[PDB]
Design an enzyme around this catalytic site. Structure first.
Site, PDB file in Angstrom:
ATOM      1  N   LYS A 127    -186.077 -44.891 -33.853  1.00 43.03           N
ATOM      2  CA  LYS A 127    -186.000 -46.261 -33.371  1.00 43.03           C
ATOM      3  C   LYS A 127    -187.176 -47.116 -33.843  1.00 43.03           C
ATOM      4  CE  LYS A 127    -185.733 -45.083 -29.060  1.00 43.03           C
ATOM      5  NZ  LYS A 127    -186.000 -43.644 -29.342  1.00 43.03           N
ATOM      6  N   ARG A 137    -185.458 -47.832 -20.153  1.00 42.48           N
ATOM      7  CA  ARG A 137    -185.458 -46.385 -20.272  1.00 42.48           C
ATOM      8  C   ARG A 137    -184.778 -45.722 -19.084  1.00 42.48           C
ATOM      9  NH1 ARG A 137    -189.390 -44.664 -24.228  1.00 42.48           N
ATOM     10  NH2 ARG A 137    -189.433 -42.361 -24.398  1.00 42.48           N
ATOM     11  N   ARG A 196    -194.382 -36.107 -37.125  1.00 42.99           N
ATOM     12  CA  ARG A 196    -194.741 -37.502 -36.876  1.00 42.99           C
ATOM     13  C   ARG A 196    -196.261 -37.681 -36.899  1.00 42.99           C
ATOM     14  NH1 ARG A 196    -191.706 -40.852 -32.322  1.00 42.99           N
ATOM     15  NH2 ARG A 196    -192.659 -39.338 -30.897  1.00 42.99           N
ATOM     16  N   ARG A 204    -199.890 -37.779 -32.078  1.00 43.09           N
ATOM     17  CA  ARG A 204    -199.882 -38.183 -30.682  1.00 43.09           C
ATOM     18  C   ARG A 204    -199.965 -36.971 -29.763  1.00 43.09           C
ATOM     19  NH1 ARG A 204    -194.665 -42.110 -30.130  1.00 43.09           N
ATOM     20  NH2 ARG A 204    -194.685 -40.923 -28.161  1.00 43.09           N
ATOM     21  N   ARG A 234    -189.962 -34.140 -22.479  1.00 38.91           N
ATOM     22  CA  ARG A 234    -189.533 -35.516 -22.703  1.00 38.91           C
ATOM     23  C   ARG A 234    -188.042 -35.594 -22.986  1.00 38.91           C
ATOM     24  NH1 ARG A 234    -191.567 -39.006 -25.699  1.00 38.91           N
ATOM     25  NH2 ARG A 234    -192.578 -38.205 -27.594  1.00 38.91           N
TER      26      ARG A 234
HETATM   27  N1  ADP Z   1    -189.619 -48.010 -20.646  1.00 42.49           N
HETATM   28  C1  ADP Z   1    -190.441 -47.035 -20.255  1.00 42.49           C
HETATM   29  N2  ADP Z   1    -190.433 -46.588 -18.996  1.00 42.49           N
HETATM   30  C2  ADP Z   1    -191.249 -45.606 -18.574  1.00 42.49           C
HETATM   31  N3  ADP Z   1    -192.147 -44.984 -19.364  1.00 42.49           N
HETATM   32  C3  ADP Z   1    -192.218 -45.342 -20.670  1.00 42.49           C
HETATM   33  C4  ADP Z   1    -191.366 -46.405 -21.201  1.00 42.49           C
HETATM   34  N4  ADP Z   1    -191.637 -46.557 -22.509  1.00 42.49           N
HETATM   35  C5  ADP Z   1    -192.602 -45.665 -22.820  1.00 42.49           C
HETATM   36  N5  ADP Z   1    -192.907 -44.926 -21.716  1.00 42.49           N
HETATM   37  C6  ADP Z   1    -193.952 -43.895 -21.637  1.00 42.49           C
HETATM   38  O1  ADP Z   1    -194.498 -43.709 -22.944  1.00 42.49           O
HETATM   39  C7  ADP Z   1    -194.149 -42.393 -23.424  1.00 42.49           C
HETATM   40  C8  ADP Z   1    -193.847 -42.377 -24.907  1.00 42.49           C
HETATM   41  O2  ADP Z   1    -192.702 -43.183 -25.138  1.00 42.49           O
HETATM   42  P1  ADP Z   1    -192.378 -43.743 -26.603  1.00 42.49           P
HETATM   43  O3  ADP Z   1    -193.634 -44.299 -27.217  1.00 42.49           O
HETATM   44  O4  ADP Z   1    -191.158 -44.606 -26.483  1.00 42.49           O
HETATM   45  O5  ADP Z   1    -192.127 -42.400 -27.443  1.00 42.49           O
HETATM   46  P2  ADP Z   1    -190.770 -41.835 -28.125  1.00 42.49           P
HETATM   47  O6  ADP Z   1    -190.322 -42.863 -29.170  1.00 42.49           O
HETATM   48  O7  ADP Z   1    -191.236 -40.540 -28.755  1.00 42.49           O
HETATM   49  O8  ADP Z   1    -189.802 -41.684 -26.971  1.00 42.49           O
HETATM   50  C9  ADP Z   1    -192.981 -41.936 -22.521  1.00 42.49           C
HETATM   51  O9  ADP Z   1    -192.843 -40.533 -22.479  1.00 42.49           O
HETATM   52  C10 ADP Z   1    -193.428 -42.560 -21.192  1.00 42.49           C
HETATM   53  O10 ADP Z   1    -194.517 -41.834 -20.618  1.00 42.49           O
HETATM   54  N1  ADP Z   2    -183.765 -41.108 -40.500  1.00 42.51           N
HETATM   55  C1  ADP Z   2    -184.845 -40.331 -40.427  1.00 42.51           C
HETATM   56  N2  ADP Z   2    -184.864 -39.107 -40.994  1.00 42.51           N
HETATM   57  C2  ADP Z   2    -185.961 -38.329 -40.912  1.00 42.51           C
HETATM   58  N3  ADP Z   2    -187.082 -38.728 -40.288  1.00 42.51           N
HETATM   59  C3  ADP Z   2    -187.157 -39.930 -39.693  1.00 42.51           C
HETATM   60  C4  ADP Z   2    -186.020 -40.834 -39.721  1.00 42.51           C
HETATM   61  N4  ADP Z   2    -186.370 -41.946 -39.042  1.00 42.51           N
HETATM   62  C5  ADP Z   2    -187.650 -41.758 -38.628  1.00 42.51           C
HETATM   63  N5  ADP Z   2    -188.104 -40.562 -39.025  1.00 42.51           N
HETATM   64  C6  ADP Z   2    -189.404 -39.942 -38.749  1.00 42.51           C
HETATM   65  O1  ADP Z   2    -189.217 -39.086 -37.599  1.00 42.51           O
HETATM   66  C7  ADP Z   2    -190.198 -39.415 -36.577  1.00 42.51           C
HETATM   67  C8  ADP Z   2    -189.585 -40.153 -35.384  1.00 42.51           C
HETATM   68  O2  ADP Z   2    -189.215 -41.478 -35.774  1.00 42.51           O
HETATM   69  P1  ADP Z   2    -189.629 -42.705 -34.823  1.00 42.51           P
HETATM   70  O3  ADP Z   2    -189.240 -43.968 -35.550  1.00 42.51           O
HETATM   71  O4  ADP Z   2    -191.077 -42.546 -34.408  1.00 42.51           O
HETATM   72  O5  ADP Z   2    -188.626 -42.413 -33.606  1.00 42.51           O
HETATM   73  P2  ADP Z   2    -188.571 -43.074 -32.120  1.00 42.51           P
HETATM   74  O6  ADP Z   2    -189.227 -44.425 -32.187  1.00 42.51           O
HETATM   75  O7  ADP Z   2    -187.079 -43.119 -31.832  1.00 42.51           O
HETATM   76  O8  ADP Z   2    -189.280 -42.076 -31.216  1.00 42.51           O
HETATM   77  C9  ADP Z   2    -191.285 -40.212 -37.294  1.00 42.51           C
HETATM   78  O9  ADP Z   2    -192.259 -39.291 -37.732  1.00 42.51           O
HETATM   79  C10 ADP Z   2    -190.538 -40.918 -38.426  1.00 42.51           C
HETATM   80  O10 ADP Z   2    -191.308 -41.137 -39.586  1.00 42.51           O
END
Ligand code: ADP
Ligand code: ADP
Length: 214
Positions: free
Chosen positions: A13, A88, A123, A156, A167
């Site tokens: 995303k 979320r 990542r 991270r 998660r």
């Molecule tokens: N909308 C939300 N509501 C609650 N917690 C959130 C939200 N967005 C992010 N978080 C917090 O930040 C953490 C990382 O989320 P995010 O950066 O979106 O990672 P990812 O793309 O790997 O899911 C979540 O596990 C949670 O602790």
């Molecule tokens: N289509 C894809 N195929 C393989 N790897 C991807 C793709 N899109 C993103 N990634 C990689 O996989 C990981 C998760 O993508 P990210 O955009 O951070 O996901 P989200 O925001 O949904 O948690 C990152 O390390 C990113 O560079």
């Protein structure tokens, strides 16, 4: 234009949000990025959020809603925005609906758990900016370095494998119900809903999203 991106952690995303921000001129509103920025700044929200995020748990709905409310009131969101990681939970979606905020597109990323776990291993982030890379599928131009500042990339804390597993469980319990939530909103004519195959290469997912958004 207002967009929500839905999908599991690691589905791609934030990567795709960058391209949408660049082409359509609307800011990425990532609650994860905003919460990490609060930690980096040492704000009171950051003091509350760090330990919760490190544990793989969700920050309280009331805190995140307030954070988003303030963010989208800022001048750069007057003509639209992209929500990335918010809502979320059902209460977050109900709060936005109760506020009277409709979105134009809800875009769901379809990626299986088995691929997410394997994928998040690679990542890497430029921690100050939040720029995201993957050592294999979307590498920086110079290994280990940010393309913009040349600074060393980091991993991270919440991308450790056991935390990712937790998660993901929480995603399926609390967040995957938004698929039906916004499918129902689309059936009522309140948004357009589309699903993309997020297992395809980054460039192919980008082209698919470009076709949907025009
Ligand atoms: N909308 C939300 N509501 C609650 N917690 C959130 C939200 N967005 C992010 N978080 C917090 O930040 C953490 C990382 O989320 P995010 O950066 O979106 O990672 P990812 O793309 O790997 O899911 C979540 O596990 C949670 O602790
Ligand atoms: N289509 C894809 N195929 C393989 N790897 C991807 C793709 N899109 C993103 N990634 C990689 O996989 C990981 C998760 O993508 P990210 O955009 O951070 O996901 P989200 O925001 O949904 O948690 C990152 O390390 C990113 O560079």
């Amino acid at each position: 234009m207002r967009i929500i991106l839905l999908g599991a952690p690691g589905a791609g995303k934030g990567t795709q949000a960058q391209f949408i921000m660049e082409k359509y001129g609307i800011p990425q509103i990532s609650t994860g990025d905003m919460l990490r920025a609060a930690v980096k700044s040492g704000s009171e929200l950051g003091k509350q959020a760090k330990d919760i995020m490190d544990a793989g748990k969700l920050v309280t709905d009331e805190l995140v809603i307030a954070l988003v409310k303030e963010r989208i009131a800022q001048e750069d969101c007057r003509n639209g925005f992209l929500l990335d990681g918010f809502p979320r939970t059902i209460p977050q979606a109900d709060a936005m609906k109760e506020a009277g905020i409709n979105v134009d597109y809800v875009l769901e990323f379809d990626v299986p758990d088995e691929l997410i776990v394997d994928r998040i291993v690679g990542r890497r982030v430029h921690a100050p900016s939040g720029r995201v890379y993957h050592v294999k599928f979307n590498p920086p131009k110079v290994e280990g370095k940010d393309d913009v500042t040349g600074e060393e990339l980091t991993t991270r804390k919440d991308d450790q494998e056991e935390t990712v597993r937790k998660r993901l469980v929480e995603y399926h319990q609390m967040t995957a119900p938004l698929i039906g939530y916004y499918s129902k909103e689309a059936e009522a004519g309140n948004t357009k809903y589309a699903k993309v195959d997020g297992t395809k290469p980054v460039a192919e997912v980008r082209a698919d999203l470009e076709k949907i958004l025009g």
